[PDB]
Amino acid sequence: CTPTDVRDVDI
Amino acid sequence: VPEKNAVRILWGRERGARAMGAQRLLQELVEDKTRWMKWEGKRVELPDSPRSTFLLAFSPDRTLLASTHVNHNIYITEVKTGKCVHSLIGHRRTPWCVTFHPTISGLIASGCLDGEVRIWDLHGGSESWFTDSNNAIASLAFHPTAQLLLIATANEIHFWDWSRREPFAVVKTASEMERVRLVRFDPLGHYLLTAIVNPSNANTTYRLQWWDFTKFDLPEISNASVNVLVQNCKIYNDASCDISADGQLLAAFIPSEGILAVYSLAPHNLGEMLYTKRFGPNAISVSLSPMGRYVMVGLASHMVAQVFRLQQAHGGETSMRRVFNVLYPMHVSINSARWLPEPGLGLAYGTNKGDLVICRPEAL
Amino acid sequence: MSYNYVVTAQKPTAVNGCVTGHFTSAEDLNLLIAKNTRLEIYVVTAEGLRPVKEVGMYGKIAVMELFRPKGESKDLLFILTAKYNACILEYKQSGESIDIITRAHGNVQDRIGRPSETGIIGIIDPECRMIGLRLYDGLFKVIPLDRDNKELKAFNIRLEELHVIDVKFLYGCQAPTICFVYQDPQGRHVKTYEVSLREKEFNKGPWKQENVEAEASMVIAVPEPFGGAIIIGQESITYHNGDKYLAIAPPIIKQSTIVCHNRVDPNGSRYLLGDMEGRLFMLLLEKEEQMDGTVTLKDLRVELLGETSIAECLTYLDNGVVFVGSRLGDSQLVKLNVDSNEQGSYVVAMETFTNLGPIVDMCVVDGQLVTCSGAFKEGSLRIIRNLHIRTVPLYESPRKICYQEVSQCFGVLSSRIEVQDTTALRPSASTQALSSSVSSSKLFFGEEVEVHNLLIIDQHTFEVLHAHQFLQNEYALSLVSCKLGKDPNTYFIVGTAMVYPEEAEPKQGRIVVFQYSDGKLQTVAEKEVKGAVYSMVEFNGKLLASINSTVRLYEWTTEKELRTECNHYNNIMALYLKTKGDFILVGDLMRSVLLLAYKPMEGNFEEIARDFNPNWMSAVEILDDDNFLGAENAFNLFVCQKDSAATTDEERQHLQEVGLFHLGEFVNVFCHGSLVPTQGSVLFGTVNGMIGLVTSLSESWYNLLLDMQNRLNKVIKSVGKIEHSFWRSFHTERKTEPATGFIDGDLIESFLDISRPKMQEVVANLREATADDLIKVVEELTRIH
Structure with missing residues (x-):
C-alpha cells in the first residue's frame, strides 16, 4: 500500500 | 527607455517599426494585468478513478498536459477543451516523472519505482529497459539537439540512447548513500544540473552543482568540491526546483524555518542570492511565471497557494509581497502548482484526492 | 465547410533591400530590388534604368548578398527566406530566353533558439570562404563554401554574449575574423573573434576590446588599403584599428540617428549616410603616405548634402546618380553634382516612383x-x-x-x-x-x-x-x-x-x-x-x-x-x-x-x-x-x-x-x-x-480548383525549389499545420502564362475536359479583381 501523500513515501 | 505606453506601441506596430522588445513589453503588460481579476476552477473528467495525482508536465510546444496517478497509469488531456484524449496504461506501480521530449513530437518518457523506462509513442509504440537491482528511478531529462537520455537511478547515471538496447556510459558517485534525485537540463541544452545527497552523521540535505555539458564531456560526480551553487537545500521531487523559461533564474528551498530563495544563473553573477522570503514547514512546490516576474508557492496540510511578485532587486525582507489568494471551490492537499506556459492563461494544480483542475481568469 | x-x-x-553588382554579364551594372516577395532586376544605362526580369518568390526576402567565387565571370546571388530557406542562384541567357538556375538549396532552422529582437543578419566573407547567419540569440551559424556543400550544411557555435547588435567581416586578414558590438548592464563594448572552419571554434581575436557610447548601433568595415572598422553612433563617430584611435563629434549629427550606409569609392575615401528625416550625409577620409610604408588616416569630416525621403536602402550606381529606397514614402533617383544651387543644396531630383x-x-x-x-x-x-x-x-x-x-x-x-x-x-x-x-x-x-x-x-x-x-x-x-x-x-x-x-x-x-x-x-x-x-x-x-x-x-x-x-x-x-x-x-x-x-x-x-x-x-x-x-x-x-x-x-x-x-x-x-x-x-x-x-464559392468549384492546385505544382518550376506547401501553411513560432480552405489564387491565375506544349500535362484525366474547355474557367475568375 503506497501512501497517498508525497511526504511519507520512501524512494 | 524603449517606450512604456501601449498606445504608442500599437501605433509603432501599425507602421512596421519592430524597434526594441515591443512584444516583450506587451506580454509584460498582459501579465501585470490578470492580477485584479477572479479565477474559477473547471474540473477534468478522467476515465478511471484515480485517488491521487503527483506530477504535471506540458507539451513540447504549448498545447497538451500530462498527469500521473497512483493508479499505475498516465493520463494526457487537452488544455484548450479539458478532455482526456489518451490513456497510456502499462506500468506496474506508480510512476514518478514524465519529462515530455522538448524537440520533435509527442515523445513521452516515464519512470517507476521498479526500474522501468517506457518511452511511449502516443499513437502506438513502446520500449522498455530494466535495472539490475529493482531500484527506483528518481528522474530523467532529454537532450534538445543530440540523441541522449539520462536516467536518475541509484547513485549512477547511465546516459542511455533510445536506438540500441543498452546504455554506453556509467558514472559513479564514490560512496553508496550519496544518491541522485534531479538531472534537469537547461532550455538551450548547454548545461546540466544535478542534486545529490550531502553526507552527514538529522534530516537529509542535498547539494545542487552546475556542471558543463558543452562538448559532451562526462561529468565527474566523485568530487564534492567543484562547481557548487547552493550547498544546502531540500528536494522532494522534480517539482521542488524550477528554472525560468529564459534560464536566467533558479528557485530553491534552502532550510534554516524553511526560507525561499532564487539564485541568478547569469555568467557574471552566478551565485547571488537576490530575492528571499521566509515560509513555514508546509511548502511543497514552487513555480515561476513565464516572463519571470511572479512566483507561486503551493501549500499543503481552504488555501491552495500563494503568489508573489519580485520587487526589490538585491535583498531585504520586503522583497515580493502577497498579491494573490487562490481557494478550493468546495482534508485535501496539493502536490503541484505549475504555471501554464502561455503568458497569462491560468493555473493548474493537482489534488490529493485525485482531481485535476484548471483555473482561468475572469473579470467582475 | x-x-x-x-x-x-x-x-x-x-522596398526593404537593394544591392548592386555584376549579375547579368561581365560588362554591365545591375541593380536588384526585392520589395517583399518579388525580385526586380534592372540594367543601369546612361539614360536611366531599364528592366529585364521580374520573378516572384515563395516567401518573403529578408537578406540578400552578392559574392564572386574564384574562377568565374558572373557573380552568384544568395537569398534567405524569413521562413529559414536558402538558395544560391545564377543567370543564364539562352538565346532569347532568360531563366534563373539554382545551384544549391536547403533548409537551416533550429527548433531551440529564440528569435532575437534585432532581426536576421547575414554577412558573407569578402574572400568568399564563409557565410555568417545570426538567427537566434547566442547562436552563430557557419556555412562552408567548397563547391561540395550542395545541400548547405551548417554547424552552430555557442556565443556567451547574448545581446548582439551588428556583426561584420573585417578586411585584410590571413584568416576569417569577425567583430561586433554586444550589450550588457555595464555599457556596450566591441569585441572581435576569429572563426576557424577546420575546428569549429573562435580561436584568438586580433585585438582587445574597447568601450563605446551608449547608442552605438552600426559597424562598417573599411577596404584593404586602410584596414579597421568604423562605428557610428549618436553624436559619436569612432575609429579603432590595432593601435590607433581617431574620433570626432560633429554637431550636425545630433537631431537624428543614422540608419543606412553605402560605400561610394572602391577605396573607401567616400561614404554615404542617412537619417530618419532625410538629411543625405557624406563622410570623408584623408590619406597620408608615411615615407616608405602604408597609408594612415589623418582626420574625418562629415558635411551636409540636402534632403530626400525616408531611406531604408541606399546605393550608388555610377557617374553621380544615387538610388534611394523607402518604406514610408516614395523612392527617388537623385544626382550629385559639384556646384551650389539656391538655398545651399547639392541634390536634385529627376525620377519618382510609386509606393x-x-x-x-x-x-x-x-x-x-x-x-x-x-x-x-x-x-x-x-x-x-x-x-x-x-x-x-x-x-x-x-x-x-x-x-x-x-x-x-x-x-x-x-x-x-x-x-x-x-x-x-x-x-x-x-x-x-x-x-x-x-x-x-x-x-x-x-x-x-x-x-x-x-x-x-x-x-x-x-x-x-x-x-x-x-x-x-x-x-x-x-x-x-x-x-x-x-x-x-x-x-x-x-x-x-x-x-x-x-x-x-x-x-x-x-x-x-x-x-x-x-x-x-x-x-x-x-x-x-x-x-x-x-x-x-x-x-x-x-x-x-x-x-x-x-x-x-x-x-x-x-x-x-x-x-x-x-x-x-x-x-x-x-x-x-x-x-x-x-x-x-x-x-x-x-x-x-x-x-x-x-x-x-x-x-x-x-x-x-x-x-x-x-x-x-x-x-x-x-x-x-x-x-x-x-x-x-x-x-x-x-x-x-x-x-x-x-x-x-x-x-x-x-x-x-x-x-x-x-x-x-x-x-x-x-x-x-x-x-x-x-x-x-x-x-x-x-x-x-x-x-x-x-x-x-459555394460548394463545387472548390473540388475542381483544389484538384488543379495540386497538379499545377508538378509542372511549374519554383525559383528556389519550394513546393508551395511549406510556404502556405500557418507557420507560427510553436505550431505548424497544413492550410485547409483558402485557394492559392495567383497560382491558379498564373495558369494562363505557361506555353501551349506544357498545357497538355495538366488536366489529362479530368466529359473528360480539354484545354480549350478549361481555359475559360480561369477567364471567369480573372475578372473579380
Whole structure:
C-alpha cells in the first residue's frame, strides 16, 4: 500500500 | 527607455517599426494585468478513478498536459477543451516523472519505482529497459539537439540512447548513500544540473552543482568540491526546483524555518542570492511565471497557494509581497502548482484526492 | 465547410533591400530590388534604368548578398527566406530566353533558439570562404563554401554574449575574423573573434576590446588599403584599428540617428549616410603616405548634402546618380553634382516612383478607393480608381477616414510632430488652412510633443476647409459619422484618450461629437469617460464603443445627452469591434474572436460563444452570417464558425477553426466593396502595401480548383525549389499545420502564362475536359479583381 501523500513515501 | 505606453506601441506596430522588445513589453503588460481579476476552477473528467495525482508536465510546444496517478497509469488531456484524449496504461506501480521530449513530437518518457523506462509513442509504440537491482528511478531529462537520455537511478547515471538496447556510459558517485534525485537540463541544452545527497552523521540535505555539458564531456560526480551553487537545500521531487523559461533564474528551498530563495544563473553573477522570503514547514512546490516576474508557492496540510511578485532587486525582507489568494471551490492537499506556459492563461494544480483542475481568469 | 478565394490586385511596392553588382554579364551594372516577395532586376544605362526580369518568390526576402567565387565571370546571388530557406542562384541567357538556375538549396532552422529582437543578419566573407547567419540569440551559424556543400550544411557555435547588435567581416586578414558590438548592464563594448572552419571554434581575436557610447548601433568595415572598422553612433563617430584611435563629434549629427550606409569609392575615401528625416550625409577620409610604408588616416569630416525621403536602402550606381529606397514614402533617383544651387543644396531630383506605403485606413465611396498612406513628413491620401493612383500630398500622418453623403466632404484625423524650445519645422497641411478652431474645454525643454487635429476634406478638388486642434497630450483613435436616435441631422463622433509618457495605459477619454452644418463645426456633447476609446461603431441607433476592456452601449435622449444602457466587463483590452446589421459583434486583442448577442426583450448582453487557443489579432471582419474573419500578427489568416452541435455545455460555446492560411503580409484593415461566379467581396490593405480581395464559392468549384492546385505544382518550376506547401501553411513560432480552405489564387491565375506544349500535362484525366474547355474557367475568375 503506497501512501497517498508525497511526504511519507520512501524512494 | 524603449517606450512604456501601449498606445504608442500599437501605433509603432501599425507602421512596421519592430524597434526594441515591443512584444516583450506587451506580454509584460498582459501579465501585470490578470492580477485584479477572479479565477474559477473547471474540473477534468478522467476515465478511471484515480485517488491521487503527483506530477504535471506540458507539451513540447504549448498545447497538451500530462498527469500521473497512483493508479499505475498516465493520463494526457487537452488544455484548450479539458478532455482526456489518451490513456497510456502499462506500468506496474506508480510512476514518478514524465519529462515530455522538448524537440520533435509527442515523445513521452516515464519512470517507476521498479526500474522501468517506457518511452511511449502516443499513437502506438513502446520500449522498455530494466535495472539490475529493482531500484527506483528518481528522474530523467532529454537532450534538445543530440540523441541522449539520462536516467536518475541509484547513485549512477547511465546516459542511455533510445536506438540500441543498452546504455554506453556509467558514472559513479564514490560512496553508496550519496544518491541522485534531479538531472534537469537547461532550455538551450548547454548545461546540466544535478542534486545529490550531502553526507552527514538529522534530516537529509542535498547539494545542487552546475556542471558543463558543452562538448559532451562526462561529468565527474566523485568530487564534492567543484562547481557548487547552493550547498544546502531540500528536494522532494522534480517539482521542488524550477528554472525560468529564459534560464536566467533558479528557485530553491534552502532550510534554516524553511526560507525561499532564487539564485541568478547569469555568467557574471552566478551565485547571488537576490530575492528571499521566509515560509513555514508546509511548502511543497514552487513555480515561476513565464516572463519571470511572479512566483507561486503551493501549500499543503481552504488555501491552495500563494503568489508573489519580485520587487526589490538585491535583498531585504520586503522583497515580493502577497498579491494573490487562490481557494478550493468546495482534508485535501496539493502536490503541484505549475504555471501554464502561455503568458497569462491560468493555473493548474493537482489534488490529493485525485482531481485535476484548471483555473482561468475572469473579470467582475 | 468553408471555401474562400484570395487574389492579389496590386503587388507590394515598399522596398526593404537593394544591392548592386555584376549579375547579368561581365560588362554591365545591375541593380536588384526585392520589395517583399518579388525580385526586380534592372540594367543601369546612361539614360536611366531599364528592366529585364521580374520573378516572384515563395516567401518573403529578408537578406540578400552578392559574392564572386574564384574562377568565374558572373557573380552568384544568395537569398534567405524569413521562413529559414536558402538558395544560391545564377543567370543564364539562352538565346532569347532568360531563366534563373539554382545551384544549391536547403533548409537551416533550429527548433531551440529564440528569435532575437534585432532581426536576421547575414554577412558573407569578402574572400568568399564563409557565410555568417545570426538567427537566434547566442547562436552563430557557419556555412562552408567548397563547391561540395550542395545541400548547405551548417554547424552552430555557442556565443556567451547574448545581446548582439551588428556583426561584420573585417578586411585584410590571413584568416576569417569577425567583430561586433554586444550589450550588457555595464555599457556596450566591441569585441572581435576569429572563426576557424577546420575546428569549429573562435580561436584568438586580433585585438582587445574597447568601450563605446551608449547608442552605438552600426559597424562598417573599411577596404584593404586602410584596414579597421568604423562605428557610428549618436553624436559619436569612432575609429579603432590595432593601435590607433581617431574620433570626432560633429554637431550636425545630433537631431537624428543614422540608419543606412553605402560605400561610394572602391577605396573607401567616400561614404554615404542617412537619417530618419532625410538629411543625405557624406563622410570623408584623408590619406597620408608615411615615407616608405602604408597609408594612415589623418582626420574625418562629415558635411551636409540636402534632403530626400525616408531611406531604408541606399546605393550608388555610377557617374553621380544615387538610388534611394523607402518604406514610408516614395523612392527617388537623385544626382550629385559639384556646384551650389539656391538655398545651399547639392541634390536634385529627376525620377519618382510609386509606393502605397503603410495603408492605415481605407474607405469605399462612389467604385473608388480613398486610403491613407505614409507617415511622418512623407505620406498622404491616395485615390485608387479603376489602376490609376492619384496623390494629394499633405505633410502629416493620417490615422483614420470617413465620409458623408450630405456634405460632400471627408474627415481625416492626422498627427503633427513639433518640438519646443512649439513652432513646427515645415509648413504642413494641418496649419495652412482657411479656418481653425482651438477646442476650448475647461474639464480637466528640447522634448518632442505630438499634437492631433481633425481636418475636413471637401471632395470636389481635395481642398482643406476647416481644422480643429485638440487639447494638450490628447490622442485621437476612433471616428465615425452616422445618424442617431430620432434627429434628422448627421453628426461627427470622435473618440479620444489622454496619454501620459510615464506610466502604463490611459484612464481617461472623451466622446466629443461634432456637426459641420453651414460653414464650420460646433460641439454639443462631451460625456467624459474613464478609459481609452480604441474603436467605436454605429449600432441600430445607439453608440457602441469598447472603453478600455469594457463594452458599453450608449443611448441618445431628445436633447444632446449621451447615456449608457448596458455593460459587459469581461474582455481584456478589446480594441477592434465590428457588427453586421443584427445584434452581432466581436472582440479581439488578448484572445481569439468571441461573439455576443443583444436581447431586445430585456436590455442586457448575452455571451454566446468564445473561441480558445489565444491568437493576437490585427483585424476582424464578418463575412456572411457565421463565417468570421481574423488576421493574426504572425502573417496568417483563419476563419471561424459557430460549430453546430448539441451538448448545451460544450456546444454552441466553442468556435471551430475551419480554415487556416499564410498570407505572409500584415493585414491592417477590412472593408466591403468591389472596384469592378462568387458571392461577396471584401478588400484589405497591408503594411507593405497591397490590395487583395476575398471571395466565396459555394460548394463545387472548390473540388475542381483544389484538384488543379495540386497538379499545377508538378509542372511549374519554383525559383528556389519550394513546393508551395511549406510556404502556405500557418507557420507560427510553436505550431505548424497544413492550410485547409483558402485557394492559392495567383497560382491558379498564373495558369494562363505557361506555353501551349506544357498545357497538355495538366488536366489529362479530368466529359473528360480539354484545354480549350478549361481555359475559360480561369477567364471567369480573372475578372473579380
